Every structure is written in C-alpha cells, then in structure tokens.
Design a protein around this ligand. Structure first.
Ligand SMILES: Cc1ccc2nc(NCc3cc(C)nn3C)[nH]c2n1
Ligand SMILES: Cc1ccc2nc(NCc3cc(C)nn3C)[nH]c2n1
Ligand SMILES: Cc1ccc2nc(NCc3cc(C)nn3C)[nH]c2n1
Ligand SMILES: Cc1ccc2nc(NCc3cc(C)nn3C)[nH]c2n1
Ligand SMILES: Cc1ccc2nc(NCc3cc(C)nn3C)[nH]c2n1
Ligand SMILES: Cc1ccc2nc(NCc3cc(C)nn3C)[nH]c2n1
Lengths: 159, 159, 159, 159, 159, 159
C-alpha cells in the first residue's frame, strides 16, 4: 500500500542507482523508477533506451516498475499515487541541491515526503556523468554498470 | 509491519523533532522515538524528564512509542526489530557526520536502513543546543518548543 | 550619502531578490539594483525586459534605482560612486563562489566593500533557475515572484 | 546615524578582527566592538584584559567603541540602538553556524540586520583559537596580532 | 627516479598553476605538466597554444616537462611512468570532485597515488575561468598570469 | 633522501592510518609516524601505549619510524629534517581545518610542504573517535583496527 517514486535522468542507470532502488524496494511495497526525459541535459541515451536499460537491469526486483515521464515531478508523484520520493545522496553538492528541490516539492505537494538514502561505499563516488567521461576516453567502467548497460554504452560510443 | 527508530538525545525535544517524528509516522507503521540515557555531555534534562516531555509532546501521534535506551543505536534497533533508522538532516555539518554514522551502522547492522528526512523551513536552523543557549541568555524561544517543554525549560532556568 | 549596488542577472527578479534589496534599502541611503546583461548565461528575458520587471517590482521602495550594465562590476560600482556591493548568500555553493568574487573585486577596487546578507527562511531555497525550471513544467510559482514578474514569465513560456 | 555592533569573544583580538572592525567603520557611523563577558569555555584572557587589549588595538579608529556585555547578543543590540550586527565569514563551518544564528536573531530582533564581511586573504585562515594553540606550542604568531596583544600573550604564556 | 604528473586544462596557465607545479618540483625528481586537449570544455586557447604558453611560463624550472594529451589520465600517467598525480585544492567544490576523480583513478591504476597540494593565500581564489571572465570585461588580470600568458590573453580577446 | 612526517594523535591507530602511512612509504624514502604526547583531550591510550601499538602495526613497513613528540608540528618537522608533512583527508570538515593548518604551517616553516592523501573507500568514514565510541557502546570494530590494537582496545574497555 506504500508507494514510492525514485526519479532521475538515469543516463544511463549505474550500479549506484541499482543499489538505491534495491534499498527502496526493501522499505516500500511498490517502487516506481521514474526516468525523466530531460531534454535540457541532452542525454546520451533516448528515453526509450533508458527505460529499456533500466527495466532489464531491475528485472530481478519484483516490486519495481520503470516508467518514463516529462511531467513536473510532484504531479507525476501524485498521478502515480506515491507518497514518498526517493533520492540518493552522495556528496555536499547534491545535498544542497536536493534540499532546495525537496523544499520546492513540499510546496507543490505537501503530502509527498522526500526521503534520502546514502549510497554504499562501493558506489559513493560514481555518477552517470563520471562513467560516461571515463568510457569516452576508453577507460574500463565494467565495474560500475549492469552488464546490459555496459554493452549498450560501449555500442553507443562505437558509433 | 514496518518498524522505525528515531534516536536522539532530545535535550529537550523541539518542534524540529516533532516535525521529523510526525513525518516518520506518516511513512511507517510504528515509530520508536528513542532517547539516549547517558549522553557524552551531561544533558540539561534528566532521562526521566526528557522521556516525560517527549511522551506528552507526541501523545497525539497514535503510532509513536517513546523509549529510553543506553545501548549502541544499532544494538537497540536490532532488539526492537526495527529495519529503519530515521535521521533528520539540517546542514552540511549534519550531512557529513550522518554519512559516517550511516556507513558504520551498515557495517554493524546490514539489515537496518538509514533514512534521512528534511525539516520544514520553519525549523531548519534550530537545535536543542541553540534553543538552550538562547533561553539561558534570556531570549524568547517559545515558538520553537512544545508548550510543555517551554514550561519545563522556564522552570529549569529559574533555579 | 552611503551608496550600495546590488548586482545580478535577475532573470527574472524573484521574491528572494526583493527581500535582499528591501533589506539593503533599510541600511543604505541609495541602492542601485544593477542588472548585468549576462549574454554568457543566455537569459530568458532581455535586459530591457529584466530592467522593466525589476523597476515595477521595486517601485514601492523610494531609494532604489534599477540600471542595466555590461561593464566589469567593479568599474560599474566606481562609476555609480558606490562603496558597498550587496550579495545575498543562500547555500555553501554560492558562498564559496562569492568569496572568490569578493577577493577579485577587492583586488580591482579595494575601497568597495562586499557585504553579504542572508535570505529569509521563506526564500532560502529559491533561485531564478529553479523557478524557471518549475514553470517550464507547468508548476505553480506564483508564491515566489512579484505579480508582474509571474505574469511576464507565464507569457514568455506561452510563446 | 547608523549604529552597528560587532560581537565576539576576542580572546584575544587578532589582526583578523582588526580588519573586520576597520571595514565596518568605513561603512557605518558608529561601531560597537562588543566583548562577551562570560564565554562558555573559560577564556585565556579575563574580560578586563580582553577589553583593554581591544581598546588599545582600536584606539586609532575614531568611531569604534569597545564595550563588555553579558547578555544575549540581540538584547544587547536592542539596548544599544544598533540596527546592524557585523559578523566575519571565514569558511564553510563559519557560514553554516552564522546562517543559524542569523535566522534566530531575526526571530529575536526583526529590526536588526545581520551583515557578513569577508576578511582579507592575509587573515582568512586565522582564529584566536589557532593563534593561541600555535603560541602555547612555541610557534611564532607575531604577524597575526597587534603589538600590544603579542606582548600580553607572551606574558600570559610565560607564567 | 620519482615521477609525478600534474594534469589539467591550463586554459590558460595561471600563477596558481605556477605555484603548484613549482611546489611539485621541490618534492619530486621529474614533473610532467600534462595539458588535456579538453574539447568538451571548448577551450579559449588551442592545445598547441596552451602547451607553448606553459612551456615558456615554466622554462625556469629545470625538472618540468610540458606535454599535451587526449588520453584517459590514468593511462597517460602509466605511459609516462608516473606514480604520483598532483592536484591543487582550492575550495570545497573541487575537493569533492577531486575525491571522486581520485577514487576512480585508484580503480583504473591502483599504484598511481593522488597527492593534493593547497594553494598559496595569494592564489587561493583564482581560476582560469575567473581570470578569463574578468579579462573579457576589460578588468586588469596582470597580477594573476605569467607575463607571456597575459600578453597572449590580451591578444586573443583583441580579435 | 626525501623525509616526511605523518603527525597525529593515533588514539588508537586505525586501519585508515595504516592505509595513509603505507601510501606515504610508497612515495617518500623515510616516513616518521609522529605521535603527539599531550593531546588537548585526555587520550584513551597513554603515549607509551599509542607508540607501542603503532610500532607493532607498522613493523612490516621498512621505511617507517614511529616517534613521540610534544612540540609544535612544524618545530618537530624542522628538527627531523622533514620537508613533507602528510595529512589524510576524509570529509569537508577535514579539508577546511587542514587548509587553515597548512596556511599556518607555511607561515611557520616555509620549507615544509603539506601533502594531502585520500584514504581508501574502505576507511573514508572512520576515525579513532568513532571507533572508540562504537566499541565503548559494545559494537563490533574488529574490521577497522590492526589485530594488536583490537586486543588492546578490548582490554582497555574491559576494566
Ligand atoms: C521542483 C522541481 C524542479 C525541477 C523539476 N523538473 C521536473 N521535471 C523534469 C525532471 C524531473 C527529474 C527528476 N529530472 N527532470 C529533468 N520537475 C521538477 N520539479
Ligand atoms: C555508530 C554509532 C556511533 C555512536 C553511537 N552512540 C550510540 N549510542 C549512544 C548514543 C546514541 C545517541 C543518539 N546518543 N548517544 C549517547 N550508538 C552509536 N552508534
Ligand atoms: C570580478 C568579476 C568577475 C566576473 C565579472 N563579470 C562582470 N561583469 C558581468 C556581470 C556582472 C554580474 C553581476 N553578472 N555578470 C554577468 N564583472 C565581473 N567581475
Ligand atoms: C542567537 C544567539 C545564540 C547564542 C548567543 N549567545 C549570546 N550571548 C552570549 C555570547 C555572545 C558571544 C559572542 N559570546 N557569548 C558567550 N547571545 C546569543 N544569541
Ligand atoms: C577518471 C577520469 C575522469 C575523467 C577523465 N578525463 C580524462 N581525460 C581527459 C582529461 C584529463 C584532464 C585532466 N582533463 N581532461 C579533459 N581522463 C579521465 N579520467
Ligand atoms: C599549526 C599548528 C596548530 C596546532 C598544533 N599543535 C601542535 N602540536 C601539538 C599537537 C600536534 C598534534 C597532531 N596533536 N597535538 C596536540 N602543533 C600545531 N601546529
């Protein structure tokens, strides 16, 4: 009965994201992994690609649902009947931005609670941006990505 | 079903704590507000006082239980069959210490998840320490405390 | 006789800016709200639009003067006979950047003092960028903008 | 016309404090350098010593007044008819605590504005605590102190 | 026998960079100042220009070698037989990013040690970006750049 | 040839310290692990205990020398003919204090360079203080300590 949304750009989904969504499914009955189209960020992968990659990478988790969206995130939460919004916290920089976003989301949807999870030590220093930057210079990022995502990233960069 | 602990010194409990525990009760079935018995620095209020004040200030929340404890937070969570540890996040100093505690707690009790909540803007700058310091120097702290705590703090400082 | 400048991009001016400039006029005899053309930031509103919006939003403050500029900000301060440069401080990120800018400005104009004000709790989490991002997704930002600015933002996004 | 207070422990006053108060005197008509009487941690110098040292070190500034006080900072500002409270900002730890104090002071005395000034690069890493710690361990701190304070600190440490 | 690499975009090299590389040559036998082509950052100066500017600005240091590169930085370190990677640390923002990069580099090349140096007070607030921004508005940046670099920057902006 | 000091309280030495000193020995010819004799806060272990524990835990490193000292760090470095002072960096709180210490040490001993190293992800959240606090509250800290220190800490806490 408790529904949570885990929103992000997931360009592409990393093992840090897999850790966060896994921890969310151990707390809440149903977790919506919500992939924002994010045209302003000029993503490497299309929304359809990101959704497909995330679906395969989370297929082993029975209470996850992957959906793409372009809406205001508070409206999308309401429309999914979610009362929790999950964010992962890595460093001070995101923490300050996440605090601003959480105050804005509270204004837009007061009954949506933002809950923050801290990453595992293994993934505390990675981001999609850092992984792409390493891969673009032909550095090994197999440790940081689900197998299907790593294959897709190698293929994208080969073109 | 889902059991969460909200540990702290609560010396005394403030409206920032009430905000956090209220948010936790809207997320989880049962919330244990856990008051540490023997703080490193001699608290202004005794454990018995802190428990009584917190019980009165949370009596309106049906799924809160106020309990004193003298153990390691993770040992207490384990014995209470809690799978969520609630922490409030106010500033950067908070975030960095909390990250260290969360990594340590994951080592001590892997089946315990640390969840971080953000206070309302109204309470994001207060702490029990700041309220006590202002009150001891004859400043107005009525806005930041439950009525019963306001009364108890005035009585303490009058002697 | 004490003249202060409050510089920024003001794209568009928000209620956080209104709070800062209002507080500045309670401290200093004359405040110049100085709007930088900022072509490098590709602003949503033209400089003329930003100046007009800020003029209307501050018309109730008798000792404010709104001016657009493209100059080095230390030169513009000197040319306005200002000895104080006002900046609002929201989080750690701007604080560090503001410290760098203040040291550079001190090098360029040693007699120009940078003074920093802290925002009201109400506006401590907003920025022009965040308001635009919410509005672009059709979220309600009426609370955060002067009425004339909100109308102009809705109209801009309608085209 | 404009009255400002610059409160602190000044145990002892350093060249960083002299820098801040000098900058304040170039901004405001009258600056009260306000020395707290009963610090939480037993100061190295008595209140009478700290006041005498600060008076000598600021005697060349015609619009500074050095005063001891034992009250809440806002209560003292109010009774001194000050409308500006001066704080120096050095690092991130400074900024976060100062933000909390400023929000509290706005609650306690809405007609008091908190103004933050930045030290010269020369003094941005010093504090009375660091200077005392270096001096007690037989390090050279002459550069960081007014001559009279250097003399008084050497005498204190010799006994 | 101890070889260190000091990588960066150096667009253009500043006196802060000169300070760091000078300190590195006092610690290590041979220092490679490694200039990344950095097309993603759309540099003002071409790689060949940046290399030539850095060579002239470090010609007085006998154990510095300036080289341009487009490789993964861990691979370039290995190929230069370097076991130390030098980074300068200015503020909290770079510190957090540098920590992420250092953890990634440790994954890619475990025997490459990242060592961080703190800048002189004189250069603690400057960056290539800030210097370019000031120069683009015709502000004086002679204090912050080697003579040859300042001439080249003035000439670039004159076109 | 190159002599470095690694100063600290080491109360007790942890695996984070072992990591840092091991990294330092791979960079410099001789590393002095320097244990401060009279900490500001009464250490859990006496100086003789801390030195013996650190000697045993570093006996496998051929170019480490464990020495107690009661002086200013810079005075000790100078007398040991060290030109490098090693510090470990864990978080933002670490970074800001270390920046202040490094600027002061450059004032006290210009020929001493401060070098900052980053701990493995495995140890980036631990400190002697956190380990002691967990152990005194009956938590498992075996993973974070050399075996000899684990034994000594258990014995200390048993009495
Ligand atoms: C309060 C607030 C601020 C910015 C927002 N952007 C959106 N929608 C798009 C979106 C959601 C996510 C996640 N990523 N992206 C690009 N909703 C917002 N809500
Ligand atoms: C990981 C960790 C670190 C310190 C700890 N202290 C405790 N218990 C005592 C305690 C808890 C609170 C709240 N206050 N006090 C005094 N448990 C801990 N767990
Ligand atoms: C020391 C320094 C650094 C950057 C500068 N940019 C300018 N002028 C343009 C400007 C001013 C403001 C406000 N916004 N913008 C875009 N003056 C500068 N001064
Ligand atoms: C909001 C706030 C918080 C703490 C306060 N302490 C005081 N007065 C005592 C004081 C001032 C200084 C400087 N040092 N000392 C000991 N006024 C306060 N106001
Ligand atoms: C771990 C990691 C992350 C990003 C990387 N980018 C590169 N090569 C290009 C590069 C090196 C420098 C310095 N600047 N630039 C643009 N190597 C990387 N290694
Ligand atoms: C610049 C500076 C600041 C404080 C200092 N304290 C010392 N020596 C005493 C000391 C060193 C360590 C480690 N622990 N303890 C107690 N040297 C210092 N240098």
């Amino acid at each position: 009965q408790k529904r949570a949304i885990y929103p992000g750009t997931f360009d592409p989904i990393t093992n840090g994201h897999i850790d966060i969504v896994t921890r969310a499914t151990q707390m809440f009955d149903h977790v919506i992994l919500a992939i924002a189209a994010s045209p302003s960020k000029k993503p490497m992968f299309t929304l359809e690609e990101r959704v497909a990659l995330a679906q395969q990478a989370t297929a082993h988790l029975g209470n996850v649902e992957v959906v793409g969206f372009s809406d205001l995130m508070a409206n999308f939460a309401r429309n999914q009947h979610a009362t929790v919004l999950i964010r992962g916290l890595r460093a001070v920089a995101d923490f300050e931005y996440e605090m601003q976003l959480a105050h804005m989301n509270r204004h837009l949807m007061p009954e949506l609670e933002s809950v923050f999870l801290m990453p595992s030590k293994e993934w505390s220093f990675i981001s999609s941006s850092l992984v792409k930057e390493v891969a673009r210079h032909q550095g090994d990022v197999t440790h940081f990505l689900p197998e299907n995502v790593h294959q897709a990233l190698m293929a994208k960069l080969a073109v």
